[PDB]
Amino acid sequence: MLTDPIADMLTRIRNATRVYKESTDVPASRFKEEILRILAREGFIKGYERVDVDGKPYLRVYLKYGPRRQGPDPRPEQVIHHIRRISKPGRRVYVGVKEIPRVRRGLGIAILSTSKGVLTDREARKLGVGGELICEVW
């Protein structure tokens, strides 16, 4: 049926970015929109925007890459190196402010859903809340 929408998305982005595509549709939800803002705000993507495709709501996603590169294999470095579900339908992961992960001594995100709303780790830490630990990007 489509068991995890959030993961599907996290993956559509993993997959597209690895053949250096410019854009990617994902079928649209509010919670999906949210994660994308944090993604955009921390400059892992250029951004997103709604659309309609065959009568139906998608969110186009504008990926972003490094500069073309030197020697044999000139493929760019990649702005999103690592994106990964953590809470999952078959095993939900919840953490309190005291146990929030510090992805990659600082250089990394951990998107994280709380009662104050969807938030990065430092956001959440400073707001002092924890929650369902959605995923991590670096």
């Binding site: 078959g90 095993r91 939900r92 992961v93 919840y94």
Partner: protein, 99 residues
């Protein structure tokens, strides 16, 4: 505080008494997943007032019997023959689990 549990009546086939199934969910001590677990409690019903499919609160009490230690505090909602049915199959399932 005297514990208050809420469940469903799954038997009133006993005089002044009801079997009340009570579920409960939690993180698993090692493996994360939220699991469910459930328990019948025999709760006292002096006015044989509650019946099949009532969802009821349940309270810690001074012992009424061997294994009655709770009293039906109040009705939460009537109906719920689904939950009762859900139970009752799981019970009749055990019939072709033997040798």
């Amino acid at each position: 505080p005297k514990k208050v549990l809420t469940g469903v009546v799954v038997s009133d086939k006993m005089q002044k008494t009801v079997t009340v199934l009570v579920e409960r969910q939690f993180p698993h001590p090692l493996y994360g997943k939220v699991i469910k677990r459930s328990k019948k409690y025999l709760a006292h019903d002096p006015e044989e007032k509650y019946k099949l499919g009532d969802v009821v609160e349940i309270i810690e009490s001074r012992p009424i019997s061997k294994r009655k230690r709770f009293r039906v505090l109040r009705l939460v909602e009537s109906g719920r023959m689904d939950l009762v049915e859900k139970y009752l199959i799981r019970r009749q399932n055990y019939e072709s689990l033997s040798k």
